Amino acid sequence: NLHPIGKIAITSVHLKLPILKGLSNDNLSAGAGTMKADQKMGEGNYALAGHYMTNQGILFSPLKNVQTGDTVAITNMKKVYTYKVTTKQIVNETQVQWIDDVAGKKLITLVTCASPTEGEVDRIIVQGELQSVKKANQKNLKIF
Numbered sequence: 001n002l003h004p005i006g007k008i009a010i011t012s013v014h015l016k017l018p019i020l021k022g023l024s025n026d027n028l029s030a031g032a033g034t035m036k037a038d039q040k041m042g043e044g045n046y047a048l049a050g051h052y053m054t055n056q057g058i059l060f061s062p063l064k065n066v067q068t069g070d071t072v073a074i075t076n077m078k079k080v081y082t083y084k085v086t087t088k089q090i091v092n093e094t095q096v097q098w099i100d101d102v103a104g105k106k107l108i109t110l111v112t113c114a115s116p117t118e119g120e121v122d123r124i125i126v127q128g129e130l131q132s133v134k135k136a137n138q139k140n141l142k143i144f
Helices: 025-030 061-065
Strands: 006-010 015-020 032-034 045-049 071-075 079-092 107-113 122-135
Touching: 015 025, 061 107, 061 122, 071 107, 071 122, 079 107
Parallel strands: 015 032, 045 107
Antiparallel strands: 006 015, 006 071, 032 045, 071 079, 079 122, 107 122
16 A cells, blocks of 8 residues: 555566655655656656664565665666666765766665664765667566
8 A cells, every 4th residue: 555656676686676756764665766746767766765674574674785886776567777886885864966967877875774773874875878679579678
């Protein structure tokens, strides 16, 4: 009853989660929440945040194991957008610049806490560049 607007797959770390609109605590506990009101898949910098771990278990923690070169796919069930990871950082929560649109680039930015410890101030950032956009068919949707 959070009404997902998509799904995210990172095959390299066996992550498959719903994409939800906004960073409600429920959204962050269930999957990847859109960090900006006006972002679109395959445009500017598409920013997604998820909790490191929930009561249930691991959620966006796998981001710590993502490597430069790994593929990240998102879909809205119209098109499938595949990104290639270009960097992974541990950064301070103050570094808001990481989610900003970057002129002439099509980026995805994935954010989670650097650990599950209470009052964690650092964030794992995985960022990638758009490699392909497809029609959401049988072939392209298999990974979700």
